[PDB]
Amino acid sequence: MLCAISGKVPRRPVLSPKSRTIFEKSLLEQYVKDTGNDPITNEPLSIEEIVESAQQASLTESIPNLLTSLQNEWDAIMLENFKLRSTLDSLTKKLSTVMYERDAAKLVAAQLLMEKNEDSKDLPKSSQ
Amino acid sequence: LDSLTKKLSTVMYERDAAKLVAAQLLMEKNEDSKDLPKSSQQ
Amino acid sequence: STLCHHSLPALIEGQRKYYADYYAYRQEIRSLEGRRKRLQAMLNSS
Amino acid sequence: MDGLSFVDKIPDGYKNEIDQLVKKEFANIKADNSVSTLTNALYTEYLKQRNNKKRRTPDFNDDDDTLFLEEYRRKYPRIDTSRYIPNESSEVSLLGIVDSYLKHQEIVLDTLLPQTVSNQWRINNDYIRQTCTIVEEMNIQQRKQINDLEIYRKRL
Numbered sequence: 001m002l003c004a005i006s007g008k009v010p011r012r013p014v015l016s017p018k019s020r021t022i023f024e025k026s027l028l029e030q031y032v033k034d035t036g037n038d039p040i041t042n043e044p045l046s047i048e049e050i051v052e053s054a055q056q057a058s059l060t061e062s063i064p065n066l067l068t069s070l071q072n073e074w075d076a077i078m079l080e081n082f083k084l085r086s087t088l089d090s091l092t093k094k095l096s097t098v099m100y101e102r103d104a105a106k107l108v109a110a111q112l113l114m115e116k117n118e119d120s121k122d123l124p125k126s127s128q
Numbered sequence: 129l130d131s132l133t134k135k136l137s138t139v140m141y142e143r144d145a146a147k148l149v150a151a152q153l154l155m156e157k158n159e160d161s162k163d164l165p166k167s168s169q170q
Numbered sequence: 171s172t173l174c175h176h177s178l179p180a181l182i183e184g185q186r187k188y189y190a191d192y193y194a195y196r197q198e199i200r201s202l203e204g205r206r207k208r209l210q211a212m213l214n215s216s
Numbered sequence: 217m218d219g220l221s222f223v224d225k226i227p228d229g230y231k232n233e234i235d236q237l238v239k240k241e242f243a244n245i246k247a248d249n250s251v252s253t254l255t256n257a258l259y260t261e262y263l264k265q266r267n268n269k270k271r272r273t274p275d276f277n278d279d280d281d282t283l284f285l286e287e288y289r290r291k292y293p294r295i296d297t298s299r300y301i302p303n304e305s306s307e308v309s310l311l312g313i314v315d316s317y318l319k320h321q322e323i324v325l326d327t328l329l330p331q332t333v334s335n336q337w338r339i340n341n342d343y344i345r346q347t348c349t350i351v352e353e354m355n356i357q358q359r360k361q362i363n364d365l366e367i368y369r370k371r372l
Contacts, residue, residue, distance in 0.1 A: 027311040057311040082259035091132050098139035105146045106240035112153045119160035127368035138175045148219035151230040174337035183218035184350050191357040198364040203372035
């Protein structure tokens with residue numbers, strides 16, 4: 001019911017036979033011309049390999065399609081992707097804080113595995 | 129975004145899972161300290 | 171995917187936890203099997 | 217690596233104590249054209265490009281360029297009445313059928329929520345049986361150890 005590239009609701013959906021994932025026609029035709037492969041599974045796919053109604057009620061107050069609707073579409077495109085670049089930069093910083101504290105905890109267990117077993121071994125030697 | 133969020137999630141869950149290893153290991157190490165010292169004294 | 175990954179890492183670490191405790195149990199069994207022989211040798215001198 | 221979760225029934229003070237040990241180790245180790253340039257600049261500035269609201273502004277008894285403006289208002293009203301005439305002919309019916317499409321889409325999301333919920337419970341259910349078995353193996357190991365510590369002192 002949706003497209004698996006943009007997140008649209010497609011008007012002419014097409015499905016690929018190598019991996020069954022429903023894509024909008026213009027977006028999947030653009031990908032095969034760029035690099036001739038399926039975007040999801042990275043398998044060989046061509047334009048001839050692809051295999052081919054939605055209602056949107058226009059608002060009662062439909063000038064606004066030129067002015068007010070079109071500015072809000074290119075505002076919401078601009079602000080979201082910039083906030084999404086801000087989302088991708090923060091996680092790669094939080095990836096670094098994850099692995100460093102992970103490797104810090106590995107050195108704790110590596111240090112404490114030598115501490116515990118030798119402390120137990122000294123209890124076994126204490127009996128003699 | 130989602131592919132490293134899997135790497136973020138799997139690390140943070142395993143970090144707190146490996147963090148619980150230390151809390152168990154430190155308490156057992158502490159028990160072996162007082163056991164030997166009370167024994168080696170007497 | 172978390173609990174799928176949490177299942178796979180913990181199932182391999184469980185065997186390493188037990189086999190470490192298994193080999194530690196074999197060494198404590200040797201101290202028990204040897205200390206009884208010295209007490210068994212007490213009645214030999216009697 | 218082996219930390220029992222369901223078995224270990226671990227205080228919040230132990231979480232703070234173990235985090236200090238981790239923190240002490242942490243201290244030791246210590247593709248577009250020019251459209252992308254405009255979109256990044258507009259979002260960083262947070263400012264939007266202005267649209268033409270001149271058609272709302274037009275006034276009577278004005279010059280030849282504004283005569284073009286008032287005739288533009290006439291073509292917009294004839295188009296607006298034509299666009300309103302299609303909606304009236306369609307009736308709500310057209311708004312009704314798109315609402316039925318939304319309920320079918322919404323139901324598919326709820327089924328994906330049950331499928332993920334069923335699978336995450338199954339991964340937990342397999343883990344819970346392993347933790348209980350790892351409990352008894354550790355408990356029997358501890359009981360055998362406490363026997364050996366007591367026996368070795370008794371023999372000596």
